[PDB]
Each structure stands twice: as C-alpha cells, then as structure tokens.
Amino acid sequence: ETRELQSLAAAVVPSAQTLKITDFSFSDFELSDLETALCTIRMFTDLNLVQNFQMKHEVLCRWILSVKKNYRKNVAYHNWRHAFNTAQCMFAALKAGKIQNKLTDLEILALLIAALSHDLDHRGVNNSYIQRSEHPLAQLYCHSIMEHHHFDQCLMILNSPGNQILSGLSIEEYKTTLKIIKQAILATDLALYIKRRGEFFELIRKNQFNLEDPHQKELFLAMLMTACDLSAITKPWPIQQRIAELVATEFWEQGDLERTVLQQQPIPMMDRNKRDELPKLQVGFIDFVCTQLYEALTHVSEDCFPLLDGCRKNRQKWQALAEQ
Ligand SMILES: CCCc1nn(C)c2c(=O)[nH]c(-c3cc(S(=O)(=O)N4CCN(C)CC4)ccc3OCC)nc12
Ligand SMILES: [Mg+2]
Ligand SMILES: [Zn+2]
Known part of the structure; x- marks a missing residue:
C-alpha cells in the first residue's frame, strides 16, 4: 500500500504512443494494476493537466491509487477496469478524436476526473434494485x-489529505470544476441520457449544433460521457465478447437478488435461465442505445468514426450468433 505508492511514484511513465492509449482499439486486458495507474498518469500529463494546474507527482499518484482502491474488485464489471477504460476512451476522444480543442482546460480536467470517478463504490446493482429493495442509499x-453516491465518493476522495489534486485552483475555479464533475457523473445515468438524446439529435440533424452556447456545451459533455461509458460496445470482437460476459455476470447476479429479495421474475436481460438470449439482447442494446449516439459524435468530430465503425462491426458479430 505505502509500498504500491512508492512503486508508482518512482516508476518511469512510458509515452502515450508506447502505451497505445491514443488507440480507440485499446485493450486493458493484459496490463497489470500498476501499469493502469501508469497509463492514467500519462493521460493527465499529455492533456497538459499536471502542468496547467500545479499537480505534485506524489499527490496525483496517491489520488489515482485512492480511486482504484474504492472500486470493488469482487464486482464483475463495474470495477476499476471499467473506470480506467472509460477514461481511456475519453482520452482518445480528446486526442485522436480531436474533441480537445473544442473545450477549455477546466472542462477537460473535469471530464477526466469524472471519467475515472463515475462509478466509485458501485455494488454491481441498479438504481431500480436499490430503490425497490429499500437500500439505505435510497433514503x-x-x-x-x-x-x-458516486459523486459523493469522488468529492470525498478529492478532499482527503494527500489526495487534493484540485488544490492549485482558485475558489472560483474549484467551484466551477466540481459543478462540471457533478453534471458529468450524473450524465452517466442511462435514464438521463435517454431523457436528453432527442434534443442533441435534433440539433445535429438541423445543423444548429454550436459549442459557443453554454446550454449546448453542457449537453455535449453529457453525451460525451455516455459515449465513453458505453465504449466497450465499440471494441474489437475478442474484447467486446469478453466484456459482455462480465456485464451479463453482473446482471445475473442482480436477477438472483430480484428473485429472492423482491420476489419477482427478473427481465430477460437479468435472468440467467435465458443465458441463451444474450446475442439478441446485445443487438437490441446496440440498435436502441449505441449506434445513434456514435453516429452523432461522428457528426461532431469526423475523427471519432472508429467508435461507430467498431460498434457496427460488433453488431454484425452479435447478429450472426443471434441466428446461431
Ligand atoms: C449500466 C450498464 C450499461 C451497459 N454497459 N455495457 C457495456 C452494456 C452492455 O454491453 N449491454 C447492456 C445491455 C443493455 C440492454 S437494453 O438497451 O436493451 N436495456 C433496455 C432498457 N434500458 C432502460 C436500459 C438498457 C440489454 C442488454 C444488455 O446487455 C446484456 C449483455 N448494457 C450495458
Ligand atoms: Mg454508471
Ligand atoms: Zn459506468
């Protein structure tokens, strides 16, 4: 622990190119926990966030390890690896996808912090499940x-001693940054994505999209977050397939809880008896949620196409299995 920290602060950080983190195709699967922390340091560095905000090396390392530790390893999918991947998709969206110079430094700082924080202390279970089971978090x-809860955890970590990576900011810039972080995290609720999609899509569709407008900037940021959150849907096939079983593992565990705690029939997505239905369900997922989103992000930035490409290729593959 104090040892993992001394390991990390002493290590050489390889370049963005060496670590492959500018690729939309990036895979975490064969990286150690230590290597993922190294990648994160690089991400903060190449977005000019260490330089622009006076982050001490030791402090950023302690924060990165604090985050990593507050994800739950026993949770099939919503753990550190997902948080890390989400951040890596953000970093590629900013760098390869060229979103970076459409945003201010404060926004980028917020997004990257948010990406890594957005699922902190997840329990492998829904909002619905939490509600209906009367869990404390729903009081x-x-x-x-x-x-x-995720934002609260994030706020709690940014403010614990030795971890204050925002301390270089003025009271004004701090308040601004937290506000963006909060909105970014809240935006990773699929319900709120569904709720605001249509406004974003009409703006694009009528060629009225314009980042100069405060309201539209907010919207775009929310969309970006969803794009990164769902980004495993865009990866090469061996990766996507592997990640899908994790997500399914996580759902099936919820279905168990729903059968015993709530005494209801879990929905196919969530029933392990219909393990067979996973392909068809993934196709449905892609069609209803993902494709339209990556189609739009591609209108915002030509260079984000690889995300939509990846998504369409995964649709073909799942559809092939859906007919056996
Ligand atoms: C909170 C988890 C969001 C998510 N992440 N990832 C990677 C996936 C995924 O791969 N599949 C699904 C998923 C979504 C639907 S859904 O779009 O049909 N579902 C319908 C109802 N809405 C409100 C939510 C999504 C159905 C099946 C799914 O996976 C089964 C392996 N969700 C996520
Ligand atoms: Mg989430
Ligand atoms: Zn997430």
Whole structure:
C-alpha cells in the first residue's frame, strides 16, 4: 500500500504512443494494476493537466491509487477496469478524436476526473434494485441514486489529505470544476441520457449544433460521457465478447437478488435461465442505445468514426450468433 505508492511514484511513465492509449482499439486486458495507474498518469500529463494546474507527482499518484482502491474488485464489471477504460476512451476522444480543442482546460480536467470517478463504490446493482429493495442509499437520495453516491465518493476522495489534486485552483475555479464533475457523473445515468438524446439529435440533424452556447456545451459533455461509458460496445470482437460476459455476470447476479429479495421474475436481460438470449439482447442494446449516439459524435468530430465503425462491426458479430 505505502509500498504500491512508492512503486508508482518512482516508476518511469512510458509515452502515450508506447502505451497505445491514443488507440480507440485499446485493450486493458493484459496490463497489470500498476501499469493502469501508469497509463492514467500519462493521460493527465499529455492533456497538459499536471502542468496547467500545479499537480505534485506524489499527490496525483496517491489520488489515482485512492480511486482504484474504492472500486470493488469482487464486482464483475463495474470495477476499476471499467473506470480506467472509460477514461481511456475519453482520452482518445480528446486526442485522436480531436474533441480537445473544442473545450477549455477546466472542462477537460473535469471530464477526466469524472471519467475515472463515475462509478466509485458501485455494488454491481441498479438504481431500480436499490430503490425497490429499500437500500439505505435510497433514503439519502431520490433520483439517480447510484450516480449521486458516486459523486459523493469522488468529492470525498478529492478532499482527503494527500489526495487534493484540485488544490492549485482558485475558489472560483474549484467551484466551477466540481459543478462540471457533478453534471458529468450524473450524465452517466442511462435514464438521463435517454431523457436528453432527442434534443442533441435534433440539433445535429438541423445543423444548429454550436459549442459557443453554454446550454449546448453542457449537453455535449453529457453525451460525451455516455459515449465513453458505453465504449466497450465499440471494441474489437475478442474484447467486446469478453466484456459482455462480465456485464451479463453482473446482471445475473442482480436477477438472483430480484428473485429472492423482491420476489419477482427478473427481465430477460437479468435472468440467467435465458443465458441463451444474450446475442439478441446485445443487438437490441446496440440498435436502441449505441449506434445513434456514435453516429452523432461522428457528426461532431469526423475523427471519432472508429467508435461507430467498431460498434457496427460488433453488431454484425452479435447478429450472426443471434441466428446461431
Ligand atoms: C449500466 C450498464 C450499461 C451497459 N454497459 N455495457 C457495456 C452494456 C452492455 O454491453 N449491454 C447492456 C445491455 C443493455 C440492454 S437494453 O438497451 O436493451 N436495456 C433496455 C432498457 N434500458 C432502460 C436500459 C438498457 C440489454 C442488454 C444488455 O446487455 C446484456 C449483455 N448494457 C450495458
Ligand atoms: Mg454508471
Ligand atoms: Zn459506468
């Protein structure tokens, strides 16, 4: 622990190119926990966030390890690896996808922090499950229960001694940054994505999209977050297939809880008896949620196409299995 920290602060950080983190095709699967922390340091560095905000090396390392530790290893999918991947998709969206110079430094700082923080202390279970099972977290919060908890955890970490990576900021810049972080985290609630999609899609469709407008900037950021959150849907096939079983593992565990705690029939997505239905379900997922989103991000930035390409290729593959 104090040893993992001394390991990390002493290590050489390889370049962005050596670590492959500018590729939309990036895979974490064969990296050690230590190597993922190294990648993260690089991400903060090449977005000019260490330089622009006076982050001490030792402090960023301690924060990165604090985050990593507050994810739950026993949770099939919503653990550190997902948080890390989400951040890597953000980093590629900013660098390879060229979103970077459409945003301010404060926004980028917020997004990257948010990407790594957005699922902190997840329990492998829904908002619905949390609500209906009367879990304590649903007395503190009445909408986006999990997402509000994730932000609270994030805030709690940014403010614990030795971990204050935002300390270089003025009271004004700090308040601004937290506000963006909160909105970014809240935006990773699929319900709120569905709720605001249509406005974003009409803006694109009528060629009225414009980042100069404060309201549209906010919207775009929310969309970006969803794009990164769902990004495993865009990876090469060996990766996507592997990641899908993890997500399914996580759902099936929830279905168990729903059968015993709530006494209801879990929905196919969530029933292990219909393990057979996974392909068809993934196709449905892609069609209803993902493709339209990556189609739009590609209108915002030509260079984000590889995300939509990846998504369409995974659709073909799942559809092939859906007919056996
Ligand atoms: C909170 C988890 C979001 C998510 N991440 N990832 C990687 C996936 C995924 O691969 N599949 C699904 C998924 C979504 C639907 S859904 O789009 O049909 N579902 C319908 C109802 N809405 C409200 C939510 C999504 C159905 C099946 C799924 O996976 C089974 C392996 N969700 C996620
Ligand atoms: Mg989430
Ligand atoms: Zn997530």
